[PDB]
Design a protein around this ligand. Structure first.
Ligand code: 5GP
Ligand code: 5GP
Ligand code: 5GP
Ligand code: 5GP
Ligand code: CA
Ligand code: CA
Ligand code: CA
Ligand code: CA
Ligand code: CA
Ligand code: CA
Ligand code: CA
Ligand code: CA
Lengths: 208, 208, 213, 213
């Protein structure tokens, strides 16, 4: 069968990744990372395609971007930049507003979400693991009666049968733990450019 | 006298700005903007210098970046990228953590700010007008006893004698109202790339 | 008003202070001020690309880069055209070529121009040609090049120049209209120096002497 | 292990599916798959620049771009070197030149190489030269170029090549070590097409026929 492109870029279980010594990375993490799972540049290239897909699907009306902090911030900043790039340099434009929330399910911060009523909402999230977080978030947002909700997740783990399938998925990754590109381990590694797998040394060094 | 470079790039009262027809911008704002005050690219060039200055001053230890949402998000994303660029491509590196707050003074969202105790905090803000907001914020953050607090503001208006002087200031602008580069008018114009002065048509079109 | 002139930089433009920006450390003390920051050049190129795509989209174009000074403007203009072509419903299919110009006088004092490098320019017959150049001064260089290319019977020739001096030749696409000053940076040189400078700048007397031939 | 080989792309590398990325619409249906996405090329160039700065920082270098295929790798490598030079305490002072190579056989079947364009290469005497090239195949081109430059007595010559094929010549700086396949994109061409393609790709049989000479 032809691929299901809705899965995003498929990173296989036997993917060895890229060797950190061949790329640049924050020097304070020297010795703390095992390998590069997804280089920064491939993330940006993939986001270019997602932005084009999103514009096709929901560019016909205003978009309310809802960033899921903190891990979503880089994917949201870059995705928004790509959408902006289209709205100014092509024939196709979309008015965007942006908001930011943190999840505890309690939603922390953000505007009064009654402002979402009748609007097209694009949730921007870092990674789907079990899918429980996204299912709960959708259930909470749906109560404000937006016109539609789309979920973009940079990463989706391959696991279970009760997963969550985002509308826009960057990469489908093995069921392992990832950091970088704003994703953290105990608040560290958000400043790392590439998505990486930490090594055992890093796991202990940054342990709480 | 030689210039006070702490003022940042000085945009004079008689600055005519740049004509929108010579640049790109979100097409949904066609007819809604008067002129470009500060092109996107000059903002990025200035941030490059600020990042270098910040690394000189406080790169010697970990930096806790505190983004003042929503208007600070683009300046914070770009400033962080420039700091990251230094931490990976030069000889000088700094570990950064990031957090996000909204101001109401109540601080909305963010981590437990007791985690700021004994740390070096870099507040990242969009624009200083009267300076009241930054003075109040500093007074609130100081109560958690960080080791030091630095304030980066992209813009500072030239006004009063009781102003606030940020540690890092991008541009000193005339005392007028600005949007773009995440700065809004009634939630609009955050997706505009350049910092602009809205025209009378835009003021009415987007009025609440 | 006349947008064909591009961004107008006025004679009393004081420019930007180097101390507020980053620049090559090896040129500290050689430059007087920034005439045009790197970032505004990129912003302006974005619009030139959009303008070019409006005029010649859905066609094949041969981009002809005038080395050496044109290389940075050409690389960036081409990237912006590529951007539109993959991210919008308009494209240009691009080929690229590179030429260097050497102007001289013959035995009766007639100006001649040798075109160095490049493909066999007979390959331009019936093609759409976009010349990409750094700066128009007197305009003599672009007038000579145009007549050289025109003899191969291209379908059309358009000229993009990053800078045009106020003193003439009018390019189809002009980034900035600048005072009549010698400028360097963004690949533009003084005696092969300063091409690695990011911002378009004016050099001081120390820089003029230090890098003199 | 041997990091001098660069990023190793294996023979059973399936590449990336074009349908998951953006690319020039005019090439839809001409390409089989993405061998190396644009973004990983940029990431790798970042590290090559850092490596080069470690080896030759605080010195003057002449960057020698091998046109046409080298232009994109050279523009981007140079931008990354410029980045370090203004944002760190190490710099290289750079000049740039451009050459095109034409290989032929003489009347006794000896391989010759004409160097087209460029400065008078006598100006390389005592200089540090960084050659920037797109791809090493058999290595014959780089061996010929090196011996041509060496006769002008430069202080040193280093070679950066974006791609090196497994089949030899070993550049000082190599981006990626690739299977022995014909590749295009990132300025690399097939019969002058595909230079405007963003990603390094392998073309299909339709593309091979359509753009044949
Ligand atoms: N940084 C990081 N966050 C993760 C990872 N896996 C899941 N998360 C985050 O953990 C939370 C739980 O995910 P869930 O299992 O509900 O899909 C979500 O906020 C998700 O984004 C991971 O590997 N790294
Ligand atoms: N978007 C936008 N925000 C502004 C402008 N001037 C001040 N602000 C914001 O208004 C608040 C009040 O500023 P203050 O007068 O206390 O310095 C701060 O959040 C400041 O960033 C402006 O011109 N545009
Ligand atoms: N680097 C540099 N080149 C210039 C400047 N002015 C003119 N040129 C170059 O000098 C040559 C002669 O320009 P023309 O007078 O024929 O327009 C052209 O190649 C033009 O691009 C300048 O200020 N700086
Ligand atoms: N566009 C393209 N050029 C190639 C490829 N392989 C080799 N070349 C170019 O072909 C010429 C001969 O390579 P050589 O065999 O001498 O290493 C060189 O200019 C080299 O850069 C390829 O796969 N694609
Ligand atoms: Ca999350
Ligand atoms: Ca987390
Ligand atoms: Ca503010
Ligand atoms: Ca506001
Ligand atoms: Ca020229
Ligand atoms: Ca010159
Ligand atoms: Ca070659
Ligand atoms: Ca070729």
């Amino acid at each position: 069968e032809a691929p299901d492109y809705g899965r995003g870029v498929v990173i296989m279980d036997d993917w060895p990744g890229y060797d950190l010594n061949l790329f640049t990375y924050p020097q304070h993490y020297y010795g703390d990372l095992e390998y590069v799972l997804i280089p920064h540049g491939i993330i940006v290239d993939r986001i270019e395609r997602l932005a084009k897909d999103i514009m096709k699907d929901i560019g016909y009306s205003d978009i309310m971007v809802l960033c899921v902090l903190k891990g979503g911030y880089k994917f949201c900043a870059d995705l928004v930049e790509h959408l902006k790039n289209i709205s100014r340099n092509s024939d196709r434009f979309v008015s965007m507003k942006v908001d930011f929330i943190r999840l505890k399910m309690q939603i922390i911060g953000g505007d009064d979400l009654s402002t979402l009523a009748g609007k097209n909402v694009l949730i921007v999230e870092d990674v789907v693991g079990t899918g429980r977080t996204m299912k709960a978030l959708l259930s909470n947002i749906e109560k404000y009666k937006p016109n539609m909700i789309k979920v973009a997740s940079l990463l989706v783990k391959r696991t279970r049968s009760d997963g969550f399938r985002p509308d826009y998925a960057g990469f489908e990754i093995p069921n392992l733990f990832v950091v970088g590109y704003a994703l953290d381990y105990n608040e560290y590694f958000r400043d790392l450019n590439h998505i990486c797998v930490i090594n055992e040394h890093g796991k202990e060094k940054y342990r709480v």
